[PDB]
Amino acid sequence: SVSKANVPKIDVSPLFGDDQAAKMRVAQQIDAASRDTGFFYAVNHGINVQRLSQKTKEFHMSITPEEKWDLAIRAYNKEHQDQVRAGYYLSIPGKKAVESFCYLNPNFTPDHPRIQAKTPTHEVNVWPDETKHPGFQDFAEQYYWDVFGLSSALLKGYALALGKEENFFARHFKPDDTLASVVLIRYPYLDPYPEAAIKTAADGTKLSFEWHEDVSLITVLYQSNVQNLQVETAAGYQDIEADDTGYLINCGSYMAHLTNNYYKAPIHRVKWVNAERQSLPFFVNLGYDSVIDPFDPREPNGKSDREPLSYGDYLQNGLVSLINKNGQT
Ligand SMILES: CS[C@H](O)[C@@H](OC(=O)[C@H](C[SH]=O)NC(=O)CCC[C@H](N)C(=O)O)C(=O)O
Numbered sequence: 001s002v003s004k005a006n007v008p009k010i011d012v013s014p015l016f017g018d019d020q021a022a023k024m025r026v027a028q029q030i031d032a033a034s035r036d037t038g039f040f041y042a043v044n045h046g047i048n049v050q051r052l053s054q055k056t057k058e059f060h061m062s063i064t065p066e067e068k069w070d071l072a073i074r075a076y077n078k079e080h081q082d083q084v085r086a087g088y089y090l091s092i093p094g095k096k097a098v099e100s101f102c103y104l105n106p107n108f109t110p111d112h113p114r115i116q117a118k119t120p121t122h123e124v125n126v127w128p129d130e131t132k133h134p135g136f137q138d139f140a141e142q143y144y145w146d147v148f149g150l151s152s153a154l155l156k157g158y159a160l161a162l163g164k165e166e167n168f169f170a171r172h173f174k175p176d177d178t179l180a181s182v183v184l185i186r187y188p189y190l191d192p193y194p195e196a197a198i199k200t201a202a203d204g205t206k207l208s209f210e211w212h213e214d215v216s217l218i219t220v221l222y223q224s225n226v227q228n229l230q231v232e233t234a235a236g237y238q239d240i241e242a243d244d245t246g247y248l249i250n251c252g253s254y255m256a257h258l259t260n261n262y263y264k265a266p267i268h269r270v271k272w273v274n275a276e277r278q279s280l281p282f283f284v285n286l287g288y289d290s291v292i293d294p295f296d297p298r299e300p301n302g303k304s305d306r307e308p309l310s311y312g313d314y315l316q317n318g319l320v321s322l323i324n325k326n327g328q329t
């Protein structure tokens with residue numbers, strides 16, 4: 001068998017308030033989890049995840065092939081050269097099971113200075129027709145802001161955990177400019193399940209998505225109640241229990257860079273499961289020009305031999321690299 005990873009449940013509600021000592025006690029738990037397997041569940045987060053899941057299902061099960069082409073990113077539709085990030089990521093029956101819809105900051109409108117400048121990694125979201133998907137765009141944009149709020153609270157906990165003031169990350173995480181994304185991923189039930197859409201790990205485990213570190217500062221993930229994630233530890237890959245009431249939190253490789261690997265970006269992978277399920281990550285990305293000077297909380301003077309990296313540079317290069325490593329999703 002495979003052993004269960006230690007993934008503690010942390011009540012993050014104090015991070016929304018003004019009880020400083022309580023917030024430090026949360027920060028301690030985040031530091032412990034970040035130093036151990038790298039994962040925890042955030043509980044008492046305030047978001048209505050059941051409704052998220054229901055609205056997302058209604059979308060995934062009603063969108064049609066026609067709409068998917070019309071919304072498709074460039075990798076699927078050459079007419080959409082501006083859609084590198086945002087839009088529909090199609091399945092390929094018989095070959096590729098997963099499909100998804102990605103959207104960015106709702107404030108990236110046509111008049112946004114970064115959109116006007118055509119700055120990489122900034123795009124205007126694309127949406128289905130309102131009459132075919134009533135309420136969906138409004139729901140989804142509101143979700144963005146709900147999960148942005150949660151992520152800002154979590155960032156105050158990570159900051160305190162690392163010995164910094166609580167706005168150390170959050171001051172770079174701002175509504176007008178964040179590069180954060182929501183991805184609404186559908187993993188289908190298929191009978192028969194084509195083997196070409198199943199990858200095999202070196203240990204024999206059947207996978208839907210291969211080992212990786214996340215391209216994020218942190219990742220704030222809702223998933224259905226179907227076990228599938230595994231984390232590499234010193235003792236090997238361990239299963240992450242599902243919990244469709246909490247958000248699964250981990251660091252991405254920007255956090256690893258900024259902390260000199262004190263908070264590692266944990267390596268993880270997605271087991272193949274023949275189950276209709278959802279995976280709804282929010283990738284907590286900063287602004288394009290955000291730079292945090294790297295540091296090391298294990299060294300007395302806090303100094304690091306890493307060089308500063310702008311978030312936009314990080315992001316543009318990370319997203320390409322992960323496509324090259326593990327394939328276009
Ligand atoms: C449990 S790994 C993850 O949440 C999810 O996989 C992803 O979303 C992958 C790796 S991080 O998980 N991420 C990407 O493919 C990056 C999408 C980025 C997006 N297209 C953007 O432009 O921001 C899954 O397959 O269940």
Ligand SMILES: [Fe+2]
Nearest residue numbers: 212213214268
């Ligand atoms: Fe991931």
